[PDB]
Ligand binder design. Structure first.
Ligand SMILES: [Ca+2]
Length: 223
């Protein structure tokens, strides 16, 4: 996250780190057995780390649980990044408590201008890199259709929303992919793609979760 602030510890209890040797993408706990992430994060062995704040130190609230099933959306498209969404079933249920908690799926799609919170352990620098130990946070608004489509002509599909700031300097980046955009208590975006991070006139693009609630429920019920 570029231009963010350090989250208060355990204040985002639905945030997960996906790990294989090290952190590579985020995700969100949506019930005690299932995490949602980005399909472009797919790897075949994934450990899910819950209750994290500092990824570099064992702090004592963590639960580490390996993925048992990984299911990417059947129409995910690798150029266009349309349908960039993946579900992971844990091999046993997360224990829910104050440090580990689910986020609600959306009741409807969000209005333009709605403020949301974005979180993750991705890169913090435009210029150069610097992957943080501590979870970072960023408040940003859902941008209108117009502002999103004018930034990325011909590339924004009906399953994508833009969230952020046209001036640059605030955005999500590599390492945040897969992680949550929560607005008024509901998960409305997954970190997906962008041109660079925090570039003027190129806000982040996010998978539009309110289109996927049926697919998520049906997949959970069958698996
Ligand atoms: Ca830790």
């Amino acid at each position: 996250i570029v231009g963010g602030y350090t989250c208060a510890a355990n204040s985002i209890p639905y945030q997960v780190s996906l790990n294989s040797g090290s952190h590579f993408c985020g995700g969100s706990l949506i019930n005690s057995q299932w995490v949602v992430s980005a399909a472009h994060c797919y790897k075949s062995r994934i450990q899910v780390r819950l209750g994290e704040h500092n990824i570099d130190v064992l702090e004592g609230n963590e639960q580490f649980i390996n993925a048992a099933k990984i299911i990417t959306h059947p129409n995910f498209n690798g150029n266009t990044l349309d349908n960039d969404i993946m579900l992971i079933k844990l091999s046993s249920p997360a224990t829910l408590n104050s440090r580990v908690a689910t986020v609600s799926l959306p009741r409807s799609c969000a209005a333009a201008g709605t403020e949301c919170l974005i979180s993750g352990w991705g890169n913090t620098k435009s210029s150069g890199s610097s992957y943080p130990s501590l979870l970072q946070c960023l408040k940003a608004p859902v941008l209108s259709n117009s502002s999103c489509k004018s930034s990325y002509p011909g590339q924004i599909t009906g399953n994508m929303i833009c969230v952020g700031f046209l001036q640059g300097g605030k955005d999500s980046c590599q390492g945040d992919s897969g992680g949550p955009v929560v607005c008024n208590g509901q998960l409305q975006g997954i970190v997906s793609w962008g041109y660079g991070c925090a570039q003027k006139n190129k806000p982040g693009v996010y998978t539009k979760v309110c289109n996927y609630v049926n697919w998520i429920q049906q997949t959970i019920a069958a698996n």
